Structure 1
Amino acid sequence: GAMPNNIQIGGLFPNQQSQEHAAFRFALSQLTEPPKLLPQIDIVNISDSFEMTYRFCSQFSKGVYAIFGFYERRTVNMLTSFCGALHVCFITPSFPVDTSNQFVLQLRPELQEALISIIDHYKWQTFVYIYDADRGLSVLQRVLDTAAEKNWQVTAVNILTTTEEGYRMLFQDLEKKKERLVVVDCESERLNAILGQIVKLEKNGIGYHYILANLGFMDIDLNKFKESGANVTGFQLVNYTDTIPARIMQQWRTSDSRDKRPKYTSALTYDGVKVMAEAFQSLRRQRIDISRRGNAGDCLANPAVPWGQGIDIQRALQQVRFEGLTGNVQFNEKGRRTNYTLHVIEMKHDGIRKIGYWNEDDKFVPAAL
């Protein structure tokens, strides 16, 4: 049969004032085709499993059809388990983890392979790897595995445990090598501070090279770092001057002016809304009969009784394919971004320039220049 004209969508957000939140509202306002996505977002501590659970169960008993929100490390397991038990989908731009089930739709592309490619490309054989551990440890594992495989000499520093002396200690046996190579793997909000810290710790007469293992390159203090002559390479998800993103920034620009550069997490929040819209428009027109109980269907039971039409909504969300702010948006059957392109940017000589791009199939292709 049919679906209602409104589709209630749950939200798990860390706060109601943020640029991701603005991206969310503005993208919802761009939708014209039915059914209408009716957001019902809650402000929640995304690090606390208890609070997230209360919200998720609260959202579920209420009959929302999917949940868009963010998840932290401590809560990733709880969210994956609850989605899998209830067949309720979670759409998120948060750092992708390993071993989600198929009901978690990850807007954010995995970086680990791209990172490996860029390291091989530069022919790095030994390097320092810096990690904070609050956004997953998969990348480090992937780095250590390839290192063992390729006989690379990797030194690992989790910044949180290292006050100032640790960084200085790495060069105790580092003369006769005129170029030190460093991978920085940390949360985006924190990238600028760590970069600033480790550049201060630099020694004279050694050449320093940095590769950013996380998106977040362009959302940093670029002028300070380029003007300092820093060598830095990172990934960029959004071409802000390509045809479709330029158009989008256009309307967004006009929208703000009556009532500046979006971060990659904002851009994914905006595509995440289109993912939901595409899925629910697609069920509506496909004539797939969906109903959901306003009833307080209790979230907790043994065994968990899955929403029976949930698998239908999971399939629609997974098969979506379109051109968004972050280029081609598409998922494999496990709910990860697939068939995406990453722009590789190299900041060098007081200049930042695109040096190529990376995708799963072609890996990395150098630009003409």
Structure 2
Amino acid sequence: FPNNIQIGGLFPNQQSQEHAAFRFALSQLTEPPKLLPQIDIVNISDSFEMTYRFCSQFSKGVYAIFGFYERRTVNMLTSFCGALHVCFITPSFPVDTSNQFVLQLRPELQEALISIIDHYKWQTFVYIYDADRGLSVLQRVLDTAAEKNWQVTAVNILTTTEEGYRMLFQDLEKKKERLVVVDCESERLNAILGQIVKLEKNGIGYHYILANLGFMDIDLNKFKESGANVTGFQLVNYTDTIPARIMQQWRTSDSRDKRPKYTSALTYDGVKVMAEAFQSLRRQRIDISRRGNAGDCLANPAVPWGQGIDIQRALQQVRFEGLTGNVQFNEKGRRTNYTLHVIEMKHDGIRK
């Protein structure tokens, strides 16, 4: 197959760990195919800007797309991917309703969170959720709360102010036992941690849970002294042989030119996913060709790309032991058969 297999990319910031990891991982690509990054810097929230960029990449004839999406523009993107039969790789938050052309390289924590809450004798607790797509995980809880009969006092951070936190915590500490779940983004978690450090983070019967796939990245140093419990999840193991070699090589190369966030790790893994699919396609000798028509995305009717279906199957079929874990995909197009590491942080203790 041709080595000019142009691939797209939608990113919010030119300089960031995620972008740097995506740029680096391509260097390791020694496969006969040559994948082009073809990055476009686009604001995620604005759906119009994104539709412009996605149609531009359609004009270029891009075979596959990698990028991020937020709550506002998940639907829009998803819709275009199921209509033009064009695949879209992403490490962003996973969604319940989606096409088969959207490959989400982020296993869902909703199931595991339920198990962890179940194991501990949790009778009542407070839930803190970010509106940034966390709602899918809220319903699950509210649905399991009825089946299993615990009380959940949800509070939203997006529409909560300092006074809101003050009142919530004041009403919370009136209870003898204090249990809290904190679903948040990567950056919102740091600000909320700062908020709780100011007060109400004493550690007097306070038990926090952090529904973030990456718990080592977060700076919980302030929590190692106050004597408070916190439980979290990890998806990436740095000690294992493949992660150790990958981290050593990558950090040595970068220094010759810290620990990556889980988002950056998934970004790096996605390059491997796309490369594996295209390597297997070249090996399987499948006829892939891009017509120069480059029809406008807003073509009435928009004929699906004939080959784009098989690509999807190929991208779904790939399987390998990547950095984060073993990479696999369900029929719906979501990570399957993976492992998470439960991790409690004691005053001086990181216990798996």
The two structures share one fold, judged by TM-score above 0.5: yes
Which of residues 291, 315, 318 in structure 2 aligns to 1:317?
315
Q: How far apart are residue 176 of structure 1 and its match?
A: 7.9
The Cα shift of 1:253 comes to: 1.7
Q: Given the superposition, is the C-alpha separation of residues 324 and 171 from structure 1 closer, same or farther in structure 2, using an over 3 Å criterion? A: closer
Tell me whether 129-138 or 52-61 shows the greater mean CA deviation: 129-138
**Separation in structure 1 between the aligned mates of residue 173 and residue 17 of structure 2, nearest angstrom:** 45
Distance (Å, rounded) in 2 between the aligned partners of 1:21 and 1:205: 38
Distance in 2, matches of 1:152 and 1:47, equals 35
- Do the aligned residues in 2 keep the contact of 1:187 with 1:214 (CA within 8 Å)? yes
Deviation of residue 175 (structure 1)? 6.9
Q: Could you give the per-residue CA deviations for residues 231-282 of structure 1, whole angstroms, max 9, x where no partner exists?
A: 1111101000011100100110221122211000110001000000010001
Between 1:302-311 and 1:193-202, the stretch displaced more is: 193-202
Q: Distance in 1 between matches of 2:166 and 2:260?
A: 35
Deviations 1:273-309 (A, max 9, x none): 0000010001100000000123332111233311110
Q: 1:206 to 1:224 in 2, by over 3 A?
A: closer
Q: In proportion to residue count, which structure has more strand?
A: 1
The secondary structure found in structure 1 opposite 2:38 is: strand
Counterpart-to-counterpart distance in 2, 1:80 and 1:161 = 26
Q: Aligned-residue CA RMSD in angstroms? A: 1.7
Q: Alpha-carbon deviations, 1:43-63, whole Å to 9, x = none?
A: 001111111111111101211
Judged with a 3 Å threshold, the aligned counterparts in structure 2 of structure 1 residues 175 and 325 are, in CA distance, closer, same or farther, namely closer
Give, in whole Å, the separation in 1 of the partners of 2:277 and 2:123: 45
- Note if contact 2:130-2:156 (Cα within 8 Å) is conserved in structure 1: yes
TM-aligned CA deviation for residue 179 of structure 1: 2.6
**Is contact 1:182–1:209 with CA below 8 Å preserved after alignment?**
yes
Of 193-202 and 284-293, the range deviating more from structure 2: 193-202
Return 188-197 or 199-208, whichever deviates more.
199-208
CA contact (8 A) 2:201 2:226 kept: no
Contact 2:210 2:230 in 1 (8 A): yes
Q: In the aligned structure 2, how far is the partner of 1:138 from the partner of 1:301?
A: 33
Contact 2:105/2:334 (<8 A) preserved: yes
The DSSP-based 3-state class of the residue aligned with 2:224 is helix
Kept after mapping to 2: 8 A contact 1:107/1:337 = yes
Query: Is the CA contact 2:233–2:341 (under 8 Å) kept in the aligned structure 1?
Result: yes
* 1:40-82 Cα distance to aligned partner (Å, 9 max, x none): 1100011111111111111012111100111111110011000
| Distance in 2 between residues matched to 1:185 and 1:343, nearest whole Å | 17
TM-score, length basis structure 2 = 0.95
For structure 1, which segment, 101-110 or 226-235, has the greater mean C-alpha deviation from structure 2 after superposition? 226-235
* 1:38 Cα deviation from its structure 2 partner: 1.4
Contact kept? 2:124, 2:150, Cα under 8 Å: yes
Q: In structure 1, what is the Cα distance between the partners aligned to 2:171 and 2:11?
A: 47
Between 45-54 and 227-236, report the one with greater CA deviation.
227-236
Percent of pairs identical after alignment? Answer: 100
Aligned length: 351
Q: Which secondary structure state, in structure 2, belongs to the residue aligned with residue 160 of structure 1?
A: coil
Check 1:38–1:122 CA distance in 2 against 1; reply closer, same or farther (3 A cut): same
Following superposition, the deviation at residue 173 of structure 1 comes to 6.4
Q: 2:134–2:183: 8 Å Cα contact kept in structure 1?
A: no
After superposition, the Cα gap between the structure-2 partners of 1:251 and 1:96, relative to the gap in structure 1 and judged at 3 Å, is: same
Contact preservation (8 Å) 1:62, 1:293: no
C-alpha displacement at 1:224, in angstroms? 2.0
Superposed CA offset, 1:311-369 (max 9, x none): 0110011111001111101000111000111111100122222xxxxxxxxxxxxxxxx
TM-score when scaled to structure 1?
Answer: 0.91
Distance 1:96 1:116, change over 3 A: same
Q: Which residue of 2 aligns with 1:361?
A: none
Contact map agreement 1:10 1:40 (CA 8 A) in 2:
yes
* Contact persistence 1:91–1:104 (CA under 8 A): yes
Q: How far did residue 229 of structure 1 move?
A: 2.0
Q: 1:171 to 1:57 in 2, by over 3 A?
A: closer
Give the secondary structure class of the aligned counterpart of 1:218: coil
User: Using a 3 Å threshold, how does the CA distance of structure 1 residues 205 and 239 change in structure 2: closer, same or farther?
Assistant: closer
Gaps of 5+ in 1: 354-369
| Mean CA deviation greater in 299-308 or 158-167 | 158-167
- Secondary structure of the 2:172 match is coil
Q: Is this contact kept in 1: 2:236–2:325, CA < 8 A?
A: yes
Deviation at 1:172, TM superposition (A): 6.5
The answer on whether the counterparts of 1:62 and 1:295 sit within 8 Å (CA) in structure 2 is no
CA contact (8 A) 1:103 1:314 kept: yes
- CA offsets 1:16-46 (integer angstroms, 9 cap, x no match): 2100111101111101112111111100011
The secondary structure found in structure 2 opposite 1:171 is: helix
- Cα distance in 2 between the residues matched to 1:174 and 1:287: 62
> Counterparts of 2:171 and 2:200 in 1: how far apart (Å)?
15
Cα deviation digits, residues 128-185 of structure 1 (max 9, x gap):
0001102331011111111111111000000122223333444676678543100001
The alpha-carbon distance between structure 1 residues 201 and 162, as it changes in their structure 2 partners (threshold 3 A), is: farther
